[PDB]
Amino acid sequence: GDQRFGDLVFRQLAPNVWQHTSYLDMPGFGAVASNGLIVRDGGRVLVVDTAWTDDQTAQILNWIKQEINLPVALAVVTHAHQDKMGGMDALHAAGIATYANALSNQLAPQEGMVAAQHSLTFAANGWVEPATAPNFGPLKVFYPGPGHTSDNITVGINGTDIAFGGCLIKDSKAKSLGNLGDADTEHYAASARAFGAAFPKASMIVMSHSAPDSRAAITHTARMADKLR
Numbered sequence: 001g002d003q004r005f006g007d008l009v010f011r012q013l014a015p016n017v018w019q020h021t022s023y024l025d026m027p028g029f030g031a032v033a034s035n036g037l038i039v040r041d042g043g044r045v046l047v048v049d050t051a052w053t054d055d056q057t058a059q060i061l062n063w064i065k066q067e068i069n070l071p072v073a074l075a076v077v078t079h080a081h082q083d084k085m086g087g088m089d090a091l092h093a094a095g096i097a098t099y100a101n102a103l104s105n106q107l108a109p110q111e112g113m114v115a116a117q118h119s120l121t122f123a124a125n126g127w128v129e130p131a132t133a134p135n136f137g138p139l140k141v142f143y144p145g146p147g148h149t150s151d152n153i154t155v156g157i158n159g160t161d162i163a164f165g166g167c168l169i170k171d172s173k174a175k176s177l178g179n180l181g182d183a184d185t186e187h188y189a190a191s192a193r194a195f196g197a198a199f200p201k202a203s204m205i206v207m208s209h210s211a212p213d214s215r216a217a218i219t220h221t222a223r224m225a226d227k228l229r
């Protein structure tokens, strides 16, 4: 189950796939968990999302060194907010090649983030343009449309039952869609459904702020998003 490593938590989800979890204290609200992914692809490791901070992200890399002990070939971050991109400097200090939606890199300075080194662009169907995501191995990057933010992207892991919705998707019992300050209220529902349609055989849905769930996370997120229109 959960492996505590310093102030972070790591959970194996499948062969070659682990979830990383980091926490940021919010006075009057609580300590908020944020989840990303670590994937071993043969002799290298791929990371989805930073932790909230550089220090926590360096701890992710320390855990990888202890538990996997293979080079981290790249990281892809799923939108330009702190829970997904706050540790970019730690990745760069470690010499890891970093990738984000072109729009995330454009937004990064004003959002207080450090931009990734490389920009992903997307075809009209939402799939990443392959030239912009070289050597991504089993990572299948998909832009579902605007939802939690205008730049949110999602990632499936080929060879597994796992798809990652980042902050776009909430769990099947979530009370609400949470912070909608940067959200696209008109398009959220369709964007959530587009994520599910891009990864139709994914039975384990991973997300930023809940434990992995069934595909009911997708249907429930979309049904709540219907109310925004």
Ligand SMILES: O=c1cc(CP(=O)(O)O)c2c(Br)cc(Br)cc2[nH]1
Residues within 6 Å of the ligand: 026, 029, 030, 032, 083, 167, 178, 179, 208, 209
């Ligand atoms: O600033 C924040 C950011 C998030 C993450 P989100 O915006 O991606 O949903 C957050 C969350 Br989950 C829960 C609470 Br309680 C407070 C929060 N405050």
Ligand SMILES: [Zn+2]
Residues within 6 Å of the ligand: 079, 080, 081, 148, 149, 167
């Ligand atoms: Zn966000």
Ligand SMILES: [Zn+2]
Residues within 6 Å of the ligand: 034, 083, 166, 167, 208, 209
């Ligand atoms: Zn989030």
